[PDB]
Design a protein around this nucleic acid. Sequence first.
DNA 1: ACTTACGGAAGG
DNA 2: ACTTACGGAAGG
DNA 3: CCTTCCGTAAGT
DNA 4: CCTTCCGTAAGT
Lengths: 828, 826
Amino acid sequence: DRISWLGQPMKIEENRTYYQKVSIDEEMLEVGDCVSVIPDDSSKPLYLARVTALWEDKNGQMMFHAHWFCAGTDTVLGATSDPLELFLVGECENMQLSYIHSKVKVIYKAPSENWAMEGGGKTYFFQLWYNQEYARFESPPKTQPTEDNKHKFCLSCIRLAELRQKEMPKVLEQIEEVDGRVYCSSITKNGVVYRLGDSVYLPPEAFTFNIKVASPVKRPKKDPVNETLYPEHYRKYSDYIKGSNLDAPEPYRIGRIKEIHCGKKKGKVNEADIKLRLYKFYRPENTHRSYNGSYHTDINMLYWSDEEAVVNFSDVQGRCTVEYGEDLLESIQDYSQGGPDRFYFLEAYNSKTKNFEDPPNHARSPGNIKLPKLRTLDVFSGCGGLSEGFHQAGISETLWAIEMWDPAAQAFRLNNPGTTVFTEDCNVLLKLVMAGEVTNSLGQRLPQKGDVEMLCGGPPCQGFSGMNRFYSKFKNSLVVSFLSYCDYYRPRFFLLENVRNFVSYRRSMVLKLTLRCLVRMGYQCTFGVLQAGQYGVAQTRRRAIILAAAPGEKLPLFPEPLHVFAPRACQLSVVVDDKKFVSNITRLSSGPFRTITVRDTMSDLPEIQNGASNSEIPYNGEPLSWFQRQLRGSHYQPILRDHICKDMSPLVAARMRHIPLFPGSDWRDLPNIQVRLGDGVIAHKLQYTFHDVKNGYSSTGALRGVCSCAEGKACDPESRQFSTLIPWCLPHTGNRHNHWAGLYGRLEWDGFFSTTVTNPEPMGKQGRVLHPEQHRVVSVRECARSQGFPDSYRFFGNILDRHRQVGNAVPPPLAKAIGLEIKLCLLS
Amino acid sequence: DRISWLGQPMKIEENRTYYQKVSIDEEMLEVGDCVSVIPDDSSKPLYLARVTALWEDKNGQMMFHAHWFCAGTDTVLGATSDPLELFLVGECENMQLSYIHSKVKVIYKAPSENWAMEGGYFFQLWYNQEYARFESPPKTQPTEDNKHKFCLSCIRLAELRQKEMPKVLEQIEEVDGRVYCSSITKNGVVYRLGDSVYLPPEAFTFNIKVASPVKRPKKDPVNETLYPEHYRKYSDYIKGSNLDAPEPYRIGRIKEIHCGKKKGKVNEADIKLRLYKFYRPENTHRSYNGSYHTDINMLYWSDEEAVVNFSDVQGRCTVEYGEDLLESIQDYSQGGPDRFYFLEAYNSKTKNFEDPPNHARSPGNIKLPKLRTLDVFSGCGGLSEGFHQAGISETLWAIEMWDPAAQAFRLNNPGTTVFTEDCNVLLKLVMAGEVTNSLGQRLPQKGDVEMLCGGPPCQGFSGMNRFNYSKFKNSLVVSFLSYCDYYRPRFFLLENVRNFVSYRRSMVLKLTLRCLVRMGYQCTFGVLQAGQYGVAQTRRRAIILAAAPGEKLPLFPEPLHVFAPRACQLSVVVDDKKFVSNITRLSSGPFRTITVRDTMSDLPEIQNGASNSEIPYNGEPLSWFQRQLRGSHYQPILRDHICKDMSPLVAARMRHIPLFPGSDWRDLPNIQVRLGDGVIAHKLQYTFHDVKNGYSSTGALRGVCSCAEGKACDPESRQFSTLIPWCLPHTGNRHNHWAGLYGRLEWDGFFSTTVTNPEPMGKQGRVLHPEQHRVVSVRECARSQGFPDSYRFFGNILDRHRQVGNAVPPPLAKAIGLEIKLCLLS
DNA sequence: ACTTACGGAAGG
DNA sequence: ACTTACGGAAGG
DNA sequence: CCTTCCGTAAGT
DNA sequence: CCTTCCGTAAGT
Ligand SMILES: Nc1ncnc2c1ncn2[C@@H]1O[C@H](CSCC[C@H](N)C(=O)O)[C@@H](O)[C@H]1O
Ligand SMILES: Nc1ncnc2c1ncn2[C@@H]1O[C@H](CSCC[C@H](N)C(=O)O)[C@@H](O)[C@H]1O
Ligand SMILES: [Zn+2]
Ligand SMILES: [Zn+2]
Ligand SMILES: [Zn+2]
Ligand SMILES: [Zn+2]
């Protein structure tokens, strides 16, 4: 209605008149309070904001600035949120007081000073800051208003100004202006300082190399496949090769900043358009050697060039460190392992000579705190792939572990000699500590409040695994059991791992309540899906990661990818209630390092026949790639362990011998032949005595059905065929299972593994488990190679037992990647 | 913590000590106040309830009765709901005072006495989770006896289950453990001896045993060179088919009622009924062939007996002997529901018809004001024609921007002020105080409108169009709500296509409902199948009902005709909460299904491209359905029985479509035809592999473009003027092989959704006559829509086709309107 | 025991 | 004009 | 429409 | 996987 100002205006500017208090419809309003307003544009029924400023413009209007809140429904929580709970966000507006519905009351629920020891009309409340882009619940900032700020204080305006000034490119020191163009010394953007002589990441389309690409050769169809010798090849019109890096992008371009120039705009320097001319760096796969010489070289070795190219400062992804070999005060192994984005070069590459030099002298550089490991409790430890990676980050000593499966707990003790491993049921053991008992029946000391500083685990996946056919279920579940451990112990850091479909299970409900509980605990928290193949292994393995940090700590961000990977497998987005959420990761284009492949994974292992049982055989050679050198160490070790194969049936064995070697091969290439096996057993041909209404007749007029369902009828028993080389069940239900692609399939050397399983079977849903050339299933060591386990890591039990230990495991590279991000928050 | 009573205790039962006030942890609680409690078994994070009783048990603890509330997110509204709005539910439980977290204050927000002239925590409505019905709260109030445990949830529960339970009224004689009765009741329906009752078709047999011999299957092999697209019919599905259609209800005449006894009293839970089997004309030896012309409510008496359970009783119907009637049988059957009649009787051994015995004979052997209704998006007027068929409203105003629909509306409504302006413009003139428009037509204003109805454009939500909050703020569905906001009628109807409540993941629905709750309107929604109300067309439409606070919210009409179960899936789900209408008839119904033969068997044979707008009937009506739309008065002239003039190539396609049920384009031969002058229809050439469909039986290919081999579509591969349309095998595999295109309806079948332009190569292209080589006529589309032959249209043949397409069937509108009638009484 | 035998839906 | 030409998702 | 992928139960 | 269905825009 009519709205009058209260008291003398405070901190008025020459063109804007801030006040202190106002009265709406005979109400009382002042800085600190909060206000409701009805929307014009959204599905929401009402908005809630916070007062900020109190100014009347010279135009005659009276407006005020408003720091909007966030209903729990507006967040990832949705309907499971607390209807009395709000969150702080980075939305802010300046608004006329006539839109004020009227005054609300929101109270700040700060975490207790005894927070780590707990866990045994309408009035709103807030406790944490929400960022809708990456779905991150963070503790609110602690910066305060001063004399300059008291009338304008808007935390959302400050976060916007600090972030935008951070993101803006800026020239720091400029050398000399020449005829309209000003040359620069040092520039910066996104908080990164760039100077002359630094190297820099650029996308692959930034510049080419002067060595001409070899692309004229094209591969036509080899021949028309016979449809009676190969009566199931017709199911391969897919033109899709599983686990192949043909669509894998090329890694970052790297150049040495020769010089920086730009332009002018309105008398001042045009910082928005900065140009960089660099010396191109040659990845070994960019020389005339290209990929076929790219097998033994390190992933961070480059080749100096004198070629030049001009690129925009806008395309700079980041800055990397590249040094010449002889100038380093330490080794190259200790230099590469001392930090990220660290490259090196020993020679130089001439485009015309196609030889390697001593690089010129203008490429040579100038001269031409004990970290406390965190006491960690690893629930569902398995073999310890998750805890091993955290150790590789050097941030944690896992003191306790819970693993009900016996072979997994034993293998865990083998690799962690200072961990008290419980084989109890996790909920049986937690109840023991709630009863006040010190040890279990065997005398193992139970961890108490204050002992564990980080809690991590990977609960069973078989419930949310998108492979198997078949509220208080969540309240009795194992993931809620893992949540009361964090509720009881109140650790400083929390990490939960599961398969990517963990956050789409039951219409995304399980995660909606998984973070719903952490925020009621006052925990900072966030989630996201990560591809293990982006962090050093040759396996597509998307796993959902839930991070959480105590209010006194800083919430970690997700690790940014190190290796490029096939794009169809790095789709890391997550949709919940039509709101798409992403991780804080900024590397989608490409990455610093080449993708890890199967040859970098297994090319050094000796040839074994199907059914290997020798648990300790010698290496007949030395590491053949950078990846193998990482897992075998540099110390002399001749014994290769766990390189054993499953003993398959003579029928299955015969099937694998007839799988072609060429990439993409699988069961659909098997011949319809008769082979006789061991003793007097005979493998029969497959009879096609039924019409396939959908698949029709063959090139030879033969039929393509093996049962009566192929004609639309009910499946008839006794039409089932046995001991066939072409398995009977795959053409049986192939039409509605994408022709069972990948089964009895081979990995390719230039490709990568699928998600490595707990039991490798060529006729299971993920059956791409044949060796690229050998007629055998993948061995236990080859699986942990694809899982990133060092060759020093040991497992326990029979062949199947140690297989499942590898399959259930978090890849240590993924855990090391995450672990490093947690260390960054340990500082300051 | 510590809980103490305060005040004198109220009336105390044998084991329960009622109190009025009590103090738990420094607060004081009175009956009628509200409390918050924390949940442990629901995904919802808090529950709120109003305290109704304050007793203390005999075991020692002190308890209280809590009538739970309904959060707006708990409802169909979900996240859009007003967050401080709650609704009343029939949920209640008794609990300890130890679970009380807080004491909330919720107040009743009643509609003002000046509520209809407006439009320029709290609770107001009652929510029914099963049917998604926001109703006004009950006016039941407490008296001294009930005031200590007064829970509206419990008396609505008690009256519900007691109306639902069977009960014996009048007992007769008790004989050796079995007591015979003369009156029983359930579901509020009283049953007496001599009455007839509905029962499922699985209730009893007939002594005429039906013949079902395995007629000839797998007749011949079809030449895949002559018919190279026949292989696409492996689905064994024919659309518009009534072979999976259930049988209507079984009807029998109660002659004796008996039951047992449990613990000395009657066992009303197990009541038995002995009936006289009634013979539908399709149950006699004539069967379906003989039951074509007979009424849908004529039965045949039989002395066959059968005993069935009273738990199987679906409803009561009234069956009278024909000659015992005081009126005609048309005045009788058109005078009420569930009304059947019989004139003869059927003997199953003799297999012909007698005159019924004397014991089958019967004993002797207020002007309602119509509503002033405004019909926005009137079209030709099919919606308000149905309302007038129910006799509940004279539609005085109407809005229709398309001229041929507004003209055709006036031709059928002579006393309606039809505005052809834009709906947004017209209300804007009412907002400015304008009396008339540019033409001098008086504008309706508040008070004049008693009912607002309309069918907004379906083109945005329809599931055939490809190119699908601000858009909601602009659209006509909110334009139609501002009319509801200004005039504030007593009743409100919104019609649209089924997926209106699935558009944008059910957000259009949740916002259409939320606005009516904010204006104080009772409201609900549901999906209805027009084929369940007397037409031979599957036409699922979402219906949104609303009622002023002072009125009573109507319920959805219960199906009158059985229909194909595949097209009557009326349930809708929004945010994984499945909602359904109040309909109770699912398996079967009172009347058989209306079929194509019942709809066009009387209309004369016409060639393709007819323009003769006024032709005579070739005889009399040939069914009950036609006799309803042609009237008892002598009318010799048939209107709008014209079909679209098709191209000579299209003309040749229709002639080559087999007449046997389920035929469509996939049966066309691949040959040449000589057309007008020297025009030739060229053959179709298969010069590409189809990697998904493989080779034929003759070794020929099944692809017509490079895409069939997985390549990019090659132009210059397109074939023109060929009998088998080139575009149909081109994109068939990812379009269900284009089932229905150039398809024929079945006489024993029903129409698909009759659209605005019948073209056989459209998405729904089974628009060919069951026998004639032509597309259905304008009248035949009006017959499938349930229009009387008395109804006039306007414009060209296309403008007429659109008028019948976008109209909502008057039968369905009549079904809804009768339910609105039952609220105007009492 | 071990080898065969096989839902979906969810995203894309 | 009018005859052809065809993306879905959402449910079952 | 096609591709994803820490599989289990029914068969013998 | 298979059926639903008050279609519209590209092209003659
Ligand atoms: N109730 C329970 N209590 C403790 N461990 C359990 C359990 N139920 C299943 N487990 C074990 O938990 C293990 C999870 S495997 C996960 C291991 C870890 N993510 C890694 O990287 O190695 C399974 O091997 C399973 O045997
Ligand atoms: N802006 C507008 N104002 C008034 N009518 C409109 C309009 N936009 C479209 N229409 C008309 O609304 C009509 C809906 S057809 C529905 C008519 C009615 N349900 C019946 O049974 O007959 C369409 O024919 C269309 O011409
Ligand atoms: Zn701001
Ligand atoms: Zn079969
Ligand atoms: Zn009650
Ligand atoms: Zn094509």
